[PDB]
Nucleic acid binder design. Structure first.
Lengths: 119, 112, 68, 96, 55, 100
RNA sequence: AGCGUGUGCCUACCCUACGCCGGCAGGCGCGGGUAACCCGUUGAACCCCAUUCGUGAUGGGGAUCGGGGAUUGCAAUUAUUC
RNA sequence: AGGAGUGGAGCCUGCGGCUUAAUUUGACUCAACACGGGAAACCUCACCCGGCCCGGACACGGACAGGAUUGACAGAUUGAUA
């Protein structure tokens, strides 16, 4: 009888945390992923995936809305989003959780088809 | 770069390169050629047209650049001044067996 | 050679004839009964009209999104 | 292609007053290096001066990556007419 | 839409971001002394630059 | 009144000439002229593969572009030297005359 | 020690002393230098000097991997590099 | 003659094979194989799975200046502020 175990910050504490206390929570590989702040170029698509992060459908296994951004982070805000992470052939669909978090989407996607040797 | 670009145009008038000298707020850029009756066209016309050819591209002021031309002293010796001779005799369309032995004889004429 | 992907057209656009009859209303008097909104934009005077879309009215080149 | 019809004669003055002009070959240079008076990108300056090329009123010359214009004397009839300039006056390439 | 999605690479680093001054090829640029020249063209035209194999 | 006439040449026959001919002639005008100061060579070494492609053997070029610098010390106002300089100018040397 | 490089048409991205914060990579100020001038008197490494370990895969060996910590980048997960 | 080595071990990277949406390709005895100044996260980049501008110069003309075509945002789609 134990839940998901993060650092010392629960999922309600994760969902509602300011974006400068959030900077001192995950690894330096993920700190400087989200230290620089806002974006003005096509990287306003992460904003548009935050905008599409509020596409939480009614009580159901949630739908797959696609992301062609493998640099998109497993944010704890996202938890409850079936995801379309493209890998050159097939859009993967792995259900997300507090365990996944502080990691990139492209990790849980196989860009290269699994290798098997013949003769 | 300036040696490359002018060679694409001034091939017919016997291009040989430059005898260029730098002076304060003047430029003696000699286009030393072989036949300079069509480096001008109509009384220094194409020479006046060759001015802001060079001036504009490289970001130069006006008044400094001024472009002159002569005949090369014994013009049969400079190789690219006689590569023009085999360029517009083969582009003219004479067989290689004649248009060469004339210009090979032309340097035994010029005492090579 | 013959490809598998279905070949992709470019649409013959909605080109409009006899435009001035609908822009304003016709009138017996010297005035004209204005239907649409004028141009309060910064870049042009009074020549551009504002459209009749569903949600708001839209000027040509100012790119300003009004509401109800 | 779309141009400003205004910004065709921002190309034609510098062609006319001196009968030679320069432009670097590139697509992605919105501010033309010599002609910053009007906003004409390098790709639009290229396409404006290759419209006069094929009908043979200007002779196009090319160095490494650079456009050059030996404005032929057949281009003088059309560009005192269409540029609306007297037949007496000459460019700065016919000056003594 | 097309025009903003026409020059959308950050063109301030990489061999693709820079370009040759002679050939517009994206390999073998002499970035020593800012020659910025495709090595094949440098070889041919270094004679009239001043680079000469004295040793 | 230290004029510092920078003499940078690609060639030796002109670096010898321009430095000497602005002293050899400047002996007759009797002004306190000094000898040319030396600076060491800068051998601009660009070592390129001879082959355009990557095939054959690896025969490397060694393109050596040596550049030298001289300057001459003086006790002179500007105009006195200017009378001598612009007479008989040759293409080799870049004469950058310093006033101070 | 000795070759050497260093502020760029396009061109933005330089070399780094010295001073502050911090164990670290690194973060921040005032200056120099288009350079026999500034980094730099290039206090280079090896061996040299003296400690220590003891014939054992050990303190040889530094592969593979986990968690952090910054920089570079518009962004690095299929660890950039430290 | 001899020295240092290599082949032996682990890793770096070039090549073949197998795999793959694509695992781009040139080169195969000395005179292919840390070779293309190729140490490719992006560009480069060739290859692939997605989407655009025609950036089809110009000549002629059935059709055009009572309008040819053009670039221009909600929103359904969308990777998109295509």
């Amino acid at each position: 009888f134990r839940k998901f175990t993060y650092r010392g910050v629960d999922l309600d504490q994760l969902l509602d945390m300011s974006y400068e206390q959030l900077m001192q929570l995950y690894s330096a590989r993920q700190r400087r992923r989200l230290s620089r702040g806002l974006r003005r170029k096509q990287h306003s698509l992460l904003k548009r995936l935050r905008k599409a992060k509020k596409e939480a459908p009614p009580m159901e296994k949630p739908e797959v809305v696609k992301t062609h951004l493998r640099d998109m982070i497993i944010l704890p805000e996202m938890v409850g989003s079936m995801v379309g992470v493209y890998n050159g052939k097939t859009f993967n669909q792995v259900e997300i959780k507090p365990e996944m978090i502080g990691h990139y989407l492209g990790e849980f996607s196989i860009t290269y088809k699994p290798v098997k040797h013949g003769r | 770069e300036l040696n490359e670009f002018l060679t694409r145009e001034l091939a017919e008038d016997g291009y040989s390169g430059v005898e260029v000298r730098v002076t304060p707020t003047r430029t003696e850029i000699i286009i030393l050629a072989t036949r300079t009756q069509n480096v001008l066209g109509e009384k220094g016309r194409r020479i006046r047209e060759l001015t802001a050819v060079v001036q504009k591209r490289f970001g130069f002021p006006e008044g400094s650049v001024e472009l002159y031309a002569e005949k090369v002293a014994t013009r049969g010796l400079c190789a690219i001044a006689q590569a023009e001779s085999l360029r517009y005799k083969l582009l003219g369309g004479l067989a290689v067996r004649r248009a060469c032995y004339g210009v090979l004889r032309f340097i035994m004429e010029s005492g090579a | 050679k013959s490809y598998t992907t279905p070949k992709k057209n470019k649409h013959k656009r909605k080109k409009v004839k006899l435009a001035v009859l609908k822009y304003y209303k016709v009138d017996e008097n010297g005035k004209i009964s204005r239907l649409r909104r004028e141009c309060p934009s910064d870049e042009c005077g009074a020549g551009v009209f504002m459209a009749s879309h569903f949600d708001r009215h839209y000027c040509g080149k100012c790119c300003l999104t009004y509401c109800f | 292609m779309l141009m400003p019809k205004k910004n065709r004669i921002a190309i034609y003055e510098l062609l006319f007053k001196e009968g030679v002009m320069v432009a670097k070959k590139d697509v992605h240079m919105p501010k033309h290096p010599e002609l910053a008076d009007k906003n004409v990108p390098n790709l639009h300056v290229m396409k404006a001066m290759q419209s006069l090329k094929s009908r043979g009123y200007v002779k196009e010359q090319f160095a490494w990556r650079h456009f050059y214009w030996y404005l032929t004397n057949e281009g003088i009839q059309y560009l005192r007419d269409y540029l609306h300039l007297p037949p007496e006056i000459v460019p700065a390439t016919l000056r003594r | 839409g097309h025009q903003q999605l026409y020059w959308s690479h950050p063109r301030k680093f990489g061999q693709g971001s820079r370009s040759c001054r002679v050939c517009s090829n994206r390999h073998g640029l002499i970035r020593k002394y800012g020659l910025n020249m495709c090595r094949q063209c440098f070889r041919q035209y270094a004679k009239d630059i001043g680079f000469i194999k004295l040793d | 009144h230290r004029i510092r006439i920078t003499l940078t040449s690609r060639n030796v026959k002109s670096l010898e000439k321009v430095c000497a001919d602005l002293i050899r002639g400047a002996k007759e005008k009797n002004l306190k002229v000094k000898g040319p100061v030396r600076m060491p060579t800068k051998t601009l070494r660009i070592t390129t593969r001879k082959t355009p492609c990557g095939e054959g053997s690896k025969t490397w070029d060694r393109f050596q572009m040596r550049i030298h610098k001289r300057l001459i010390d003086l006790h002179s106002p500007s105009e006195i030297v200017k009378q001598i300089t612009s007479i008989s100018i040759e293409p080799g040397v870049e004469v950058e005359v310093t006033i101070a």
